[PDB]
Amino acid sequence: MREIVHIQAGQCGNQIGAKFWEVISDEHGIDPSGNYVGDSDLQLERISVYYNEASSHKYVPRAILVDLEPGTMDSVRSGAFGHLFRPDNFIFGQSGAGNNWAKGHYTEGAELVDSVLDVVRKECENCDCLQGFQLTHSLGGGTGSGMGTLLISKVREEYPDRIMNTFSVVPSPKVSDTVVEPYNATLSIHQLVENTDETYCIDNEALYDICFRTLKLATPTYGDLNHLVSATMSGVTTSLRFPGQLNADLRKLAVNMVPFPRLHFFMPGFAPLTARGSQQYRALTVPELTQQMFDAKNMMAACDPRHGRYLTVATVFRGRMSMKEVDEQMLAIQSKNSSYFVEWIPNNVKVAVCDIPPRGLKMSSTFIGNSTAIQELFKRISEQFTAMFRRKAFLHWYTGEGMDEMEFTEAESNMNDLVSEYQQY
Amino acid sequence: MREIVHIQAGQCGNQIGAKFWEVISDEHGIDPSGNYVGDSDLQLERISVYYNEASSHKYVPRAILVDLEPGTMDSVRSGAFGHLFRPDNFIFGQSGAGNNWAKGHYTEGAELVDSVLDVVRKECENCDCLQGFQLTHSLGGGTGSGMGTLLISKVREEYPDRIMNTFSVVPSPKVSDTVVEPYNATLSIHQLVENTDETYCIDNEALYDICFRTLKLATPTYGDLNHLVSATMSGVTTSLRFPGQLNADLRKLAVNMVPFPRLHFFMPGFAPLTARGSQQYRALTVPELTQQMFDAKNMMAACDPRHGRYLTVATVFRGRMSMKEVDEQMLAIQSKNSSYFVEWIPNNVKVAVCDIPPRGLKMSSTFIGNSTAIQELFKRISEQFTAMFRRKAFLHWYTGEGMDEMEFTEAESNMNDLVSEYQQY
Amino acid sequence: MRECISIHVGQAGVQIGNACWELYCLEHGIQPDGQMPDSFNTFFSETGAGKHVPRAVFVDLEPTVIDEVRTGTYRQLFHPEQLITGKEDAANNYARGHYTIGKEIIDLVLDRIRKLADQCTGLQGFLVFHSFGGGTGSGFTSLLMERLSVDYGKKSKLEFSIYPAPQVSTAVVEPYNSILTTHTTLEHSDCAFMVDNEAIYDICRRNLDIERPTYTNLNRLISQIVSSITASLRFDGALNVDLTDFQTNLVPYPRIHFPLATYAPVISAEKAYHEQLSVAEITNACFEPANQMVKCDPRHGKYMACCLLYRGDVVPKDVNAAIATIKTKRSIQFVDWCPTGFKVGINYQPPTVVPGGDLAKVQRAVCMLSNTTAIAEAWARLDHKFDLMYAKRAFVHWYVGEGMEEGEFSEAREDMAALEKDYEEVGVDSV
Amino acid sequence: MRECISIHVGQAGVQIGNACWELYCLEHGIQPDGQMPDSFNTFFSETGAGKHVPRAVFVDLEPTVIDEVRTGTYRQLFHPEQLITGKEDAANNYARGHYTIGKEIIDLVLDRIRKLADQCTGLQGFLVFHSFGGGTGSGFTSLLMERLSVDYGKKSKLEFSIYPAPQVSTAVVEPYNSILTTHTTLEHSDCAFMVDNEAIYDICRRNLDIERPTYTNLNRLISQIVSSITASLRFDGALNVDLTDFQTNLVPYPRIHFPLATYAPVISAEKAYHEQLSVAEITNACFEPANQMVKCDPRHGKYMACCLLYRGDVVPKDVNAAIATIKTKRSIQFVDWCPTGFKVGINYQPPTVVPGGDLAKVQRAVCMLSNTTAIAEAWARLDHKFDLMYAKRAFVHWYVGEGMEEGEFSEAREDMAALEKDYEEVGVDSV
Structure with missing residues (x-):
């Protein structure tokens, strides 16, 4: 029911997907060997959206790991939670496309996309009611950008009515990790505009700022950044999965944040971000979560919302909290920042509330923002x-x-x- | 409710603020780790004016520690009650401005004041009903004088209706601790005249006289002087905080001692000052407290009130005492010293009485004096x-x-x- | 004999139904498994043994809320086949709930409602619980109401709707859904008792001393309103009032059928101890502008009909004296074409306190349904927001690409303009 | 039936109300939780059970004193909603209590007073307890009195005010607040029973043998005065006197309405044992210049009206003989235009001794409200202090930067000069 097919393309996509499946298995109480070792029944109530039950009650993620180089596949397989994915869902090539969008979209992307399309067709035909797809990749990369683009286009022309949403790592403003980053990013965005319903733009430099300034991490590695991105993905599809006072799936969020077909680029966020030192001095309340998620420092893309106007926002809260407090915080945020919200859309906030908070927290929330600062x-x-x-x-x-x-x-x-x-x- | 933002600037300001937070935590029964270990409910009845409740019922002082050198920050953090302040409220630079007002007000004060202003804005927006600000600094110093001045000006132009009161350590008459003391003091006073509501002028030499002659301290260190200044600050905001027979907040004192906008420089004082030897021979009564606070030797600034005339005075009593005795002592003081009070202001005394005395005492009182001897x-x-x-x-x-x-x-x-x-x- | 069917649509409707059926089970002594350790006949049916199955359907396009119902403490109270659920919700989209997702479920809902109606002997009408600014609460509610009008073209259809609040709001596309629902159901409804979340929040803060209420307290208050409305069917009183009585006495013209609900003895335990709540006091509280559960100031408009439903230790003479006092008031003004604007109902059963609730146990209570022209301002605000969003044409693609046309948007806006004109016309004094 | 509402404003008013309601609960047998293990109707209301809620509001702009009330032994006596409090006090500033801080609370206070008035059947009037030299005791008191005059433009408004003492003083800006309050309330008040802290200190030292009295003893004495004043409403006596009786018999001209309170049997236990306090003795003590509770020597002026309120074992013939003796005295002089300057009230209930107090149990007592021209000297002193401080323009910035103008200062001073002229005119003999 409302099954989601997850596709990880490229190094960035594969690493972020590995962290994502780690956090999802933590949420649903799935052992790294695939067995359920949880405590509550709500974990298995909606396990089907992300997992497939195998023979011996072992849960295999509905994930396709595609890359044009075998190094990332070997790294994912050898590490923890690597014996979780289906071995037939590792679809990789030998030559790694370099950092060339054209190589990953036209020369090697062709053969590898035929293979991964066969795998995706099998996964979709296995599904009962397909809610949509989600892709993790990087626009400034090689196989990641170009191949994620080609897969998006082909799956879109195969399944036009499903929700295709991507968590794409956009190039950073200050320092670039690839010399040809603008070319790949431009081509990937040109293809993403027409074939995607929800693109969550994530920049590594905003994540570095969050880790250094908000989490006070002395040596933030890619594990922490991927954990943040995975928490955002979690929050969204958790609103989809677990019971709540105000439910919202992928399509409801898409309806409430895409006023026009091409305006579907979002700045994600996560409210309860605290350093280990300050966790004892901070009160975890809905006003605190709202104030943090609407802060321009917390947003996961290096785009200041004060330089634009919010077309729409979505707040996906998690935990047992009062709907009155959520609504009053939303109203206060809209009233105080009336200059930062579009006038022709009244009530620019879409509120969803789930009952189950993430592991280790009492309250949480994810912020999605369709703003003109992209x-x-x-x-x-x-x-x-x-x-x-x-x-x-x-x-x-x-x-x-x-x-x-x-x-x-x-x-x-x-x-x-x-x-x-x-x-x- | 009636929250106060405390800012400590410079070495003098930071040390006096550390002692102040020690005595305040003693009054409110706050552990040096931030936990409440008190006995009475009145301690938590008004904890909000100085403290912010964190997650695990831990109270974080609403204090900003700003300095242009990291030595004082490290000393405050490493000592007792150093794990009490929020680690994000230590805003410091590297170069210490020397003893230059211009350096602390124009060159390094700029960047550091932008940062500390962001912190102060966060603290104020967290507050429910802001009563005002209080600053601890030294006028003869470097970062202290100039940076406290710049912060005062900027916070004043941001919050003009709030009460800004400063406890500033003025240069001593006999011996100077800084060669350029007159320059810094003159510039700081020129800026304090227009942007402050209540400036409590404290001189270290008057404090040395108090310690040597009244407390009979053989080796008075800066700890004792800072304890005296902290007791004065305590008394004032204790009249604000705890229940009493005759309440008076910061604004009531400001109204009753500032007849004209520029005449807001006060000589503080503390009545129950006894040496350990003489504590058994002295009767603690309202007449004794009044006689001591109005004595020219007790006043904490080296300015003899017999050389001028009291525009106004404020007596903030603490403890269970009879209002008739307080009023009759006030009347007797005004009648005996009729030559030392201004004739065009009848009843030059503002009386406040709080029910809770300081720890270890049965009665206490602080004297604030707006006199023409400044x-x-x-x-x-x-x-x-x-x-x-x-x-x-x-x-x-x-x-x-x-x-x-x-x-x-x-x-x-x-x-x-x-x-x-x-x-x- | 006077059986009535309650229909709960969407998350708001289903949760309000949870509160309502908890209240009904407590009032009638029915255990949460349907067994008892008549009065309980207009809302419950007996199946051979002591099992009492409520006469209601819980329909949603989302499995979450209905599954919470299916596994809660009342898991064995409701008939499993009358808890109808879909697979994908309407996503705050009227078109999804009315055209695309609602068409795959409406047949099942109608079949279940037909089963319930056949099980009845004399059907008084339907009670539709829904929210105005939701996907299935708007589109599916309008579709279901039109299908019911096609089928049961004579039974009364009273709907308890959560009107969007003036300031607080949980969705961005609420004006679109609200205007389209008002169009479609205004074509096919009898009267709609309205309520606002913001107003109930204010009521809770001011009266019940709760600073952090949830949807649970709001649902409990709304369930108290519904219980006061249906007490005459469920119990015996001096002056009985049926659903047709509501429809006749509260709706002067076919389009002006949006009364506002009120409940006077909203009070905590200690305050109830310190007060002597009497008929006059509760009536005055009902007519206080701050106790309205729709955030519209009644002093901005004119009352056209009031329905005072007293219950408990209530004496008719006291009610008459209180109503005379209200009429002698000058702040409370009525339209000139309604010299008699009070329908009075009295019930002998005092309101039942839910264990764990915030309302204190009282000896008497009154629910006031007031049709007034003060709702015209709320309509004006709603259509102003609709006009802004539609002028920018925002979110319109979501509705259009789901079986709707922009012509429907224009027609709904024109119908709402006509409704505003009708309210203005009925507001003015006769000359 | 003859219900009266008491309003306590500021710290002085709230603490005097604490003493007053302790005395009322002791007198009527009401336990401090409102339960009793009619007479108790002009000041208390019954809510179904034995709970007796006092008919009063405790309003302050500072949470401290009201919170002390909320957590004291009488925590469950007062209605929680009638203990109104602010967040920041007026800081001894009239402008803060009247214009800036008082405007954010006056609506709530008026709503609560309206609730109390509606709960009443026949409202005799209001009793306002406040201090002249306080922020909220002056500004908020004046604002509340003017709003009450707007609303209840016919009910009597008697205020018990702590007049500033001639020498002792706890605040520096007392003359400003006192003059402005006198202006504003003199526009809108019936009569103001005045009292001084210094005079009560002297009374305690001389009569009760207490060398270190607190505000508690002063409040107990003031509460005894208020109980003697309201005994006629609360109990039965030979000569009953209502609030309107006070207003009529004590106020000869609309502006000259500042009588002074007195209480004769202020005596300790041992001295009461050694004395034979009779009607003549207590009357002579009342007219003794040293027993006045306002530090003004009555021999410096002329009495224009006296209200002797006896209570307990009192015989009318003894009262008449004592009053004739007083009239035959030559030190006690009356104005020539009042040949009859004695309103006499007799009550059958002897004063109740508070357990823990200093007043001894007596068989009879008298409270004397005297309107005299000796208060003109106190007014002259107050306006002289105002003139000094205003000539130097001291503290004026605090008032001006808070919603006031210096023109108001000048107007208030001119009004006080007119009041002094009126006192001088009524003082002189007719020719």
């Missing part, structure tokens, strides 16, 4: 893309793989249309 | 300032930091206007 991120990508494209730098790789400059022009025109739409609204 | 202190500062300024000594530091001689001229003109107003009244 236009800043797309503008940065556009300036970098046009700076490299004007002098035609690193372009012979993409051209030789089989692309054309016309595709680059179309991608940049589409992204400029996106920024124009955001600025207009 | 003009002597400002005159001394003016002579020293003009002596150094006429020959332009130590001025190239202030000029190079980014100031101008016109600012010095304006500061000395404002202080001369202050002494003219005091002498006129």
Whole structure:
């Protein structure tokens, strides 16, 4: 019932997906060997949305791990929770596409996407009522960006009515981890605009800021960043899964935050983020959670909402809390920041409340924000893309793989249309 | 309810604030780890004015510790009651501003004041009903004077209706602890005249006299002086906090001792000051407390009230005592010293009585005095300032930091206007 | 004999039904398993043994709330086939609940309601519990009401709806759903008793001393209102009032049928101890503008009909004196075309206190259903928000790509404008 | 039937109300929880059971004193909603209590007073307990009195005010608050029974042998005065006197309405044993200049009206003989336009001794309310202090920066000058 197919593409996607399945198994009380060792019945009440029951009551995640290099597959398999995924769902190639969008979308992406599409078709036909798909990847990468794009397009043309939502790691503003990041990001965004229902843009530098300033982590590794992203994913599909006072699945959130088809890029967030030192001085209340989630420092994308206006927001609360406090905090937030919300949408907040909080917490909440400040991120990508494209730098790789400059022009025109739409609204 | 934000700036401010929070936690029965270990319910009845309740019923002082050097921050953190303050409220820099007002007000004070202003805004927005602010600093210092001045100005222009009262340690008449003391003191006073509601002028030499002559302390350290200043601060905000027969908050005292906006410099005091030897020979009665607080030897600033006339006085009594005795002592004091009180203000005494005495005492009282003898202190500062300024000594530091001689001229003109107003009244 | 069927749609409706049926079981002595250790006939049916099955359906397009019902303390009270549930909710979308997701469930709901009606002997009508700003609470409610009007074209259809609050709100697309529901059901409804979450929050804070109420307390208060409304069917009193009495006495014109609910003795235990709540006191509390459970100031409009439903130790002479005092008041003004604007019902059964609730045990209580022109301001606010969002055409794609047309948006807005005009016309004095 | 509402404003008013309601509970046999193990109707209301809720409000802008009330031995006597409190006090500032802080609370106080008045059947009037030289005792008292005059423009409004003492004083800005309060309430008051802390201190020292009295003993004496005043409403006597009787017999002109309170049998246990306190003795003690509870020498002025309220074992013939003796005295002089300057009330209930108090148990007592021109000297002193402080313009910024203007200072001073002129005019003999 309302089964979700999870696809992890590339190194970033595979690592974030591994952390995501760790936190999900923690929520549902699933042993790293696949056995249920939980305590409450609500964990197995809706285990079907993410897991498939095998023969000996062992739960196999409904996840497809796709990459163009075997190193990440080996790392995921060898580590903890690596004996959890189905061994037939590791679909990998040998050559790793470099950091080339064209390689991952046109040359090796073809064979690997045929194989992964067969696997995805099997997984979907196994499902009872498919709610939709979720993809984890990075736009600035190689196999990640291009292959996630190709899979998104093909699954979309196969299943147009399902909800396709992606948790994509966007390029950072200050320091880039890939020289050709603008090209891959621009092409990936051009493809994501038309074939995705919900794109949660995550930047690693905002995550570094959160870890250093909010969690006071001296040496934040990728494990902590992936844990944060996994907590966001958790929160959303937990509103989907567990019982609550005000339920909301993926489609309800999509309806309440996508006023126009192309305006589906969100800044995620997580409210109860405290350092180990300050956990004893802070009161965990709905006002505290709301004040933190609406703070511009907590948002997981390096885009200041004070530079734009919130088209819509979604607050997915978790835990036993009073609906009056949630609604009054929402009203106070809208009244105080009336200049930061769009006037032509009254009640720009969609509230969902789930009864089961995450492990180790009494209250929690995730913030999703459809704001016109993503236009800043797309503008940065556009300036970098046009700076490299004007002098035609690193372009012979993409051209030789089989692309054309016309595709680059179309991608940049589409992204400029996106920024124009955001600025207009 | 009636929450107070406490800001400690500089070495003097930080040490006095540490002692102040020690005595306040003693009054409210707060463990140095932040837990309540008291006995009476009145301690938690009004804990909110100074403390914030954290998650596990741990009380975090509403204090911001700001300094331009990390040594004082480390000393406060490492000592007892150092694990009491919020670790995010230690806002410090690296270069210590020397003993330069200009450095602490214009060059490093800028960045550090942006950071501390963010912290103060968070603390104020957390508050329910902000009563006002209190600042501890030294006018003859570096970061202390200049940064306390800059914070006072910025918080004042942000919160003009709140009560801003400072406990400032003024330069001593005989021996100076800083060569450039007149410059810093003059600039700080010029800024304090317009942006403060209540300035309690404290001199270390009067405190030395009190410790040697009244407390018979053979080796008085800064701990004892800071304890005296903390007892004064206690008394005032205790009249604010605990129940009493005649209540008085900060604003009531400000109304009853500030006849004119610029005449808000006070000489604090504390009545039950006895040496350990003489505690058995002395009767603790309201007449004894009154006779001691009105004695010119007890006043905590080196300004003899017999050289001027009391514009107003405030007696904040603590303990179970008879209102008739308090009023009759006040009347007798006014009648006997009719030559030492202003004629155009009848009933120059404002009386407040609180029910809860300080720990270890049965009766207590604090004396606040708006007298025209502060003009002597400002005159001394003016002579020293003009002596150094006429020959332009130590001025190239202030000029190079980014100031101008016109600012010095304006500061000395404002202080001369202050002494003219005091002498006129 | 006077059997009535209650229909609970959506999460709000299902939870209010949970509170209502807890209250009914407590009032009639029925254990939460349907057994008792007549009065209990308009709402319960007896199956051979002591098992009492409530005469209701719990319909939602989402399995979560209904599954909470199925596994709660009342797991064995409701007939398993009358707890109808879907697979995917309407996602705060009227089109999903009315056209796309609601069409796959409406047949099952109608079949179950037909079974319940056949099991009855004389059907008084239906009680529809739903929320205005929800997906299935709007679209499916409108669809179900229209199908019921097609089938039972003569039975009364009273609906208890959670009107959107003026300021607080949990959804962004509430004006769209509210306007479309008002259109569709206004075509096919008798009277709609209205309530606001914000007003009940204010009532709880001011009267019950609760600073952090949940939806549970709101549902308990609403269930008390419903119990006061249906006491005449469930118990015996001096002046009995049926559902048709509500419909006749509260609806002056076919479109103006939105009364506001009120409950006077909302009081905590200690305050109830210190007070002497009498008929005059509770009546004055009912007419106090701060005790309204819809956040509309009655002084901004004119009453056209009031239905005072007293219960407990109530004397008719005291009621008459209190109503005369209310009429002599000058702050409380009525329309000039209703010289008699009071329908009075008196019941002998005092309200039952739920163990664990906040309402104190009282000797008498009154529920006041008032049709007033003060709801016109709330309608104006709702259509203003609709006009803003529709002028920007926000969220319209969600509705259009789900079996609806923008023409329906325009038609619903025009119908709401006509409703505002009707309220304005009935407001003015006759000359 | 003759219900009266007592309003206690500020710390002084609230503590005097504590003493007064302790005395009332002791007199009527009501336990401090409102239960008894009619007479108790003008001041208490019965709620179904034996619970007796006092007919009063305790309003302050500071949570401290009201919270002491809320947690004291009488925690369960007062209705929790009638103990109204603010968050920040008026800080001895009239402007804060009248314009800035008092405007955020006056609506709640008026709502509670309206509830109390509705609960009554025949409202005799209001008793306002406050201090002249306090923030909320001046500004909020004046605001409340003006709002009550707007609402209850006919009920009597008697206020028990602590007049500032000639020499002792606890605040520096007392003349400002006193002059402004006198202005505002003198516009809207019936009569003000006045008292001084210094005079009660002197009375305690001289009569009760107490060398270190607190505010508690002062409040007990003031509560005895109030009990003697209200005994006629609370009990049965030979000559009953109502609040309107006080207003009529003590106020010759609308502005000259400041009588002074007195209580004769202020005596300790041993001295009471050694004395034979009779009607003549207590009357002579009442007219002794040293027993006045306002520090004004009556020999400096002329009596215009006296209200002798006897209680206990009192014979009318003895009262007449004592009053004739007083009239034959030459030290006690009356104005020539009042040939009859004695209103006499006799009650059958002897004063009740509070367990733990200092007053001894006596068989009879008298409270004397005297309107005299000796209060003109106290007014002159108060306006002289006001003139000094205002000429230097001291503390004026505190008042101005809080919703007031210096024009109000000048107008209040001119009104006080007019009041002094009126006292001078009524003092002089007719020719």
